Amino acid sequence: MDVVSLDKPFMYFEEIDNELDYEPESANEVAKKLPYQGQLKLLLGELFFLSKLQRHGILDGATVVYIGSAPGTHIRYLRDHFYNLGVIIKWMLIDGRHHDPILNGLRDVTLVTRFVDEEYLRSIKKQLHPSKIILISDVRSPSTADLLSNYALQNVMISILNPVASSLKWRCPFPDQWIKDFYIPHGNKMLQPFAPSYSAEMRLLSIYTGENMRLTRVTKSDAVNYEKKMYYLNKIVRNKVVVNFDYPNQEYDYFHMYFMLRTVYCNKTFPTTKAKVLFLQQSIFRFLNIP
Ligand SMILES: Nc1ncnc2c1ncn2[C@@H]1O[C@H](CSCC[C@H](N)C(=O)O)[C@@H](O)[C@H]1O
Ligand SMILES: Cn1c[n+](C)c2c1NC(N)N[C@H]2O
Fold first, then answer.
1. Which atom of ligand 2 lies closest to the CA of 177?
2. Are 7 and 164 a contacting pair, CB within 8 Å?
């Protein structure tokens, strides 16, 4: 077995301390071990992001605009969590597909069946005004062309919506499929426990200060780096059993999950962080119907 002692998991991309040549054969290997793993991946990352904003005092009173939200089953838990905490938030979930019915009948959450384009972003910006906006984008068209298009849309979301913070889907196009260099917003490249086995996707977290917008250029050389670093993370790291991690499940992803969950705010007082995390994890798994 693959046992190890780790102080902490890699929380952000920049922390990954090694790389591996990508093996195309890994694409044929099982991508998911848990039912509803995708909803879990999203729930952990979004809970982490939103808790950070709470920590900085910018969540309460904002309207969370989530684009690419359907089905969005996990969003009900996110909404309940902050709603039960006392935080005041309006949710506006926009997608061309239908949302999970469990999202209906909540006055604080508005569902919109529309694929957004630049023009629509402007109308909703006029309609939300003057509320503070928090953007979460999980739009998926794929080809590098599809990706660039999505990234180009996500940048437009930020320029038009002008949010106080954003969480964006971010997967660098593959080096052998480069088309052109492009810019993405500057942010923390948050790694995602429970992402597909060989997924190179992460979430770009950003907080906007002043009236500036900093972007960063991404080149094919960056793409080769993303490829090698995420390959090492997936093939080696995520397959480690953290023996010094005293917890019911010692797999790397649960170790990573623990670290994201220890930052989440709860009403109930716990004697230890271990107790809080166990509580949240149990609550989460129960909600998603994961054993
Ligand atoms: N311009 C656009 N506007 C809104 N939604 C879009 C879009 N382009 C793609 N999408 C949506 O992006 C979604 C990608 S999957 C999103 C899953 C969702 N975040 C959840 O929590 O389950 C699809 O629902 C797709 O319809
Ligand atoms: C097809 N896939 C999948 N996958 C994750 C990768 C691919 N192609 C690449 N050139 N690099 C990768 O990181």
1. 10
2. no
* CA 208 to centroid of ligand 2, rounded, Å: 32
Among 37, 43, 138, residue to substitute to test ligand 1 (most atoms within 8 Å of Cβ):
138
The pair of structure tokens assigned to 93 is 């979930």
Expressed in Å, this structure's resolution amounts to 1.9
Residues with CB under 6 A from ligand 2: 22, 27, 174, 176, 198, 200, 227
Strand-pairing partners, residue 167, are 136, 205
Q: Determine which residue's CA is closest to atom 8 belonging to ligand 2.
A: 174
Task: Give the pair of three-digit tokens for residue 19.
Answer: 């790389």
Ligand 1 residue neighbourhood (C-beta within 6 Å): 42, 67-72, 74-75, 94-97, 115-116, 138-140
CA–centroid distance, 115 to ligand 2, in Å, is 28
The answer to whether 72 and 103 are in contact (CB under 8 A) is yes
- Among the four given CATH numbers 3.40.50.720, 2.10.220.10, 3.40.50.620, 3.40.50.150, the one describing domain 1-291: 3.40.50.150
Which residues form the catalytic set?
169
The length of the chain is 291
DSSP codes joined into one string, the chain? --EE--SS---BGGG--------GGGGGS---SSTTHHHHHHHHHHHHHHHHHHHTT-STT-EEEEES-SS-HHHHHHHHHHHHHT---EEEEEESSPPPGGGTT-TTEEEEE----HHHHHHHHHHHTTS-EEEEE------HHHHHHHHHHHHHHHHHH--SEEEEEE-PPPGGG----EEEE--EEE--TT--TT---EEEEEE--TT---EEEE-HHHHHHHHHHHHHHHHTGGG-EETT--SS--BHHHHHHHHHHTTS--SS--SSHHHHHHHHHHHHHHHHT--
